[model samples]
Target: AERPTLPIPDLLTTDARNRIQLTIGAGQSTFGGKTATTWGYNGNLLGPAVKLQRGKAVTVDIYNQLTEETTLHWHGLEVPGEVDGGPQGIIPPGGKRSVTLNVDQPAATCWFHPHQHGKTGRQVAMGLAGLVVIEDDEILKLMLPKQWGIDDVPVIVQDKKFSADGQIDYQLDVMTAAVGWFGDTLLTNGAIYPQHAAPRGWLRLRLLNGCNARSLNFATSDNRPLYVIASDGGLLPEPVKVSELPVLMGERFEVLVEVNDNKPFDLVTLPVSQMGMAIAPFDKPHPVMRIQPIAISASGALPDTLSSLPALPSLEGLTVRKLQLSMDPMLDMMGMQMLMEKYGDQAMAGMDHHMNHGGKFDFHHANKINGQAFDMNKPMFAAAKGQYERWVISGVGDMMLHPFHIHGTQFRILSENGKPPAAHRAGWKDTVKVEGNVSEVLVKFNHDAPKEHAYMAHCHLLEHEDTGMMLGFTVG
Candidate 1:
């Protein structure tokens, strides 16, 4: 059997009025040589690649044609909470919701996904996600891979488990539901073991870790340098070459792979433990995609300076808030003990254990942020708009790392574990990793988020967020 060709999602450009239309519906897809029911924003699997220009106004009209309720959330955008597509912006089946946003941030590899409370994991894992490419003037001046699907490519990495009958499985056991769901098979652009061709020169890969729980250790099978050009927010000051790049859940990175020869190489994922803590059964090394280099006209080298970012703001006298990503071991053990007491080994089914077992897992009380679970009616705190504040985020219990993400605005990382961050992590970021050690970020919100529709700070592990590792705060 031949490997499937990598899919380049259809490019979507806005019209003169900066408006785009998207319809979320269900369809059929082939995964693991079997047909499975799936969902997408505009196509059968994932949505199209949406291009949005900076310093402009864009409106997105979202039509939910699925048989369930959902919302379109623009992750990594600096928009007001009114249009942030949080849990409050719900669109019922056959309903419609539109958001007009001002694209005011730098060019970054962001994405769009469903944010319906308690169901984000199932919806996104089912294939309801897309890429959002932001363009700016400074980035246009750079001499890099600009051709789409040629030298410049999008690599969406997601993991999924399929049933024997060839259906996408969204089931979870007590541990998976409490910790997070982990899939056995990897999918690149919805294809199993996909392959792509690139020109024999500089090839830029816009990578997104779309997996619900797994953190990707991106590296080349040849062990060459992966030139890191951008982070979650936008382009870095210069490319930082690394042998292995750790892309946490919900984070994005743009790396340049130098294809000097016509020889083919495999883009593989290293063990997540190489970076920090590892989760069992999900941290194994695997090949993500195979890249075949085709002969082409030689291209120029990358510039020394890609983009200029603002210097770190003054740190003296800034108010600091302490936040912790809590995965209580006692609670997890208690929940598991309860399950085994009733179902015993049969609880290993890992098949929608939370919902199927009459919600007995107490998932809502297992994961938390700052000792509090997510409550839609409760606002954790309030922040002064446009004023910088320092947040010291860390994991409370076991050293398991959590991708701590904040909605509404991007921030600058001050330090990780009291030490400066690496070169690749110095850019403006909306999400930062919190492991056994603490990470500090200087954050400020420029837009208003009322109490009813507040912004959120949560673990990017979608299952953690869905259960309780999330909190909401309003911005004045």
Candidate 2:
């Protein structure tokens, strides 16, 4: 088998009028030398990297050419609720909609994907996703790798399982519904065992864990230091070097790897056992992509200081909200059994539609936040428009590794597991990995969110969110 060159999606930028159009449709992709039916935003497989600049309002005209209804969610961007592209903003098959986003956030490697209520996991697994990269003036002035697809690489790492006849096999079992879907095969930028040609200098790799459930422990084969420069929200104060980086689902990080010599090195995802899930198939290390260095004499120095962020806002008079992401194996099985008994042969399909249609069954069963499953028509609470609040998120289950993510704002992690976060995680973030213990964060809503199009806070694992472990809230 010959390794294909890494498939770098074209960079879709705004024109002089600060507008772009995105079309979501289906296509065919060849993975491991087999043709598989998939979906993308504008072309085949995955979508393009949409680059936006700060202080500018970009109008995106999104058209859905797929046969089903879907939405384009800005996974990590801070936008108004009406323009956030949540589940409420649905585009019917062959319909068109537009959103004008005011790019006011810091420069970060954000992403976009389908966020329809019960179809998110299957749609995203079939490839309807892309990158939403925000650039700021401060980051543009820094001495870093700015080239796209060369020194700067956008790594969309995902895993998929294909059938013997060359189609993506997506099936949900008891294990898959309890835990999220974990694929047996790995893909980087939509290609298996891809190779990247890089210049001999400082290289920036935007690592995005786009898997449905599997957490990625990214590292090099020779165990070289990975200099992390940015997190989910934006650039850190300084580079934090580490041997291995743990990136859970829906989390993103930008790191600088120095390839001084003209030697090839492989970047791989270590076993998830280190993250507490010692399950089969995900317990083995998988090679992500091979970087073949080319001697092109590129010159760039890693800056000692990236950005100067302000101190954390005062905690005085701030409301403390505690959320528990609980999952009970026994309760989950019992609920499924009830569904089976009711729907008989069409239990799974009926459950999906029933839950999304605002029907409740076995309310306290499994995958809950604050002892309640996600209800589409109900909002959990409301928040002040411009006030900061402290949210303590914890997972109340054994061997649970949940990545807690929120929409509408990029918050700061105050602590993880009752201790100060490491240097690499002290920056701005919208998502944090919560193990058994607690993860404290400071949240503030900057825009208004009506009850109709509220924001969501839930686990980043697609299946968990699609099942029940999610909550919606509005901001006034």
Candidate 3:
């Protein structure tokens, strides 16, 4: 009952030159009085809310205070491939790296986190991610709730597992390592039960699914319709009304929740089972946060439409690149069951003949892009700067829902499952969820193109991305 309630992170400001120094460090933080070893940008836990603007020339000096390797990967912000902060760049122990971010994208809810390859899941889960809010003149016209900590809130949702002794539990074995960490505790804004007292009629909710692998079907206990105004890259052309929204990993949505009754209600996550996939009990219907509203009613109204987006290009002559996503480890585990029923113990050594590393049944070769595990050394695709390509990214079976993301570009989701994407997914997006067999997007990277330095696109399920689900491609 005595939990340290979630407090809104401090706002990060910059000088007139748009320069900011970000320092990552190791420290002890309490998740309700239980001090646990963690990492943060400036505090004991997650970092602050960094504010930037569109078309701004920004500079950041990153100081890696931890005595280990880490990196500051911008989740949605597109900068140079060198400053993109993928696995290509690393800040060694007690080292520093300066990156200049020439933000050219629209207004959006982006984020930054540690992307240290195999260590990404643990580093981020241990409290090392934060919001990067970008502003533009287009989004300023919406005039939604802008008051921080009161009406304007950053709803960062993360699911975590904890030990009985109050330590963050991230140690997992084989099967779990395959599926990724779907924790027992659902956290909103870094709290076990985050609560915010509402102060007005309409509130701006910038929702971010910051979890490692778990997808959240967020809905109000009262079933209030959520007016989604923005997607991953920025505000949508118009607000979309939805009863239940699936906030997939690495996805961000700017929703408008209007308090009509001036009453209290819960912003809760319902039972989320993807594409007929069954979920463990621990990952379902988790209470993330509560919105406690008192008698005082404030004033604000969101327009029917928010911001204008780019028109979908003519697809008549566009080249479509087909790609497949399969979890071989999942397929292997599934095949073992079917074979066991068909051949009894007779199927043992014969199926065991599957080779390792170089073969299909290996765990390290589990998550693949197109029968290829991610090799930081290999280039999956080579694109010329300003060359447009339609990437048809697909998922297999019903085992996992891949919230796929691409670095260095924000593209339009042309269609999903053979039809147009939902309203929330219609805007400029860097991340998208593949529900069925296929989803297509128009992608084109601008500005600097690199020869050796590459960009990444992969399943944002931290486990899958880290394991082998990612692919490296360069733009020249």
Best by lDDT: 2
TM-score per candidate, in order?
A: 0.91, 0.91, 0.90
Candidate 2 off by > 4 Å = 274-282, 331-365
Residue pairs whose backbone atoms clash in candidate 3: none
lDDT of 3 by residue, 1-476 (tens): 54344578777867777678888998887666687888888887788888888877778889999988988888888777888888878899899998888878888889899888767888988889989999988877767788887888898988777898888888433444455665666677777787787765887788888888777777888888989888888888888899888878888888888665556677878765542112344334556677877466655568887766767778877778777877775544754465446445543321213334345455655778888888888878786678788999988554466888988988888877568887777888887777546888998888554645678888887877776888888887
lDDT of 2 by residue, 133-205 (tens): 8999999888698778888899999988888999998755445556567567889999887999888988899
Where model 3 places Cα greater than 4 Å from the true spot, the runs are 1-5, 260-262, 275-284, 329-362
Worst 10 residues of 3 by lDDT: 346-355
Q: Which has the higher lDDT value, candidate number 1 or candidate number 2?
A: 2
Provide the global lDDT of candidate 1 against the true structure.
0.82
CA error at residue 351 for candidate 3, angstroms: 27
Global lDDT of each candidate: 0.82, 0.83, 0.77
lDDT of model number 2? 0.83
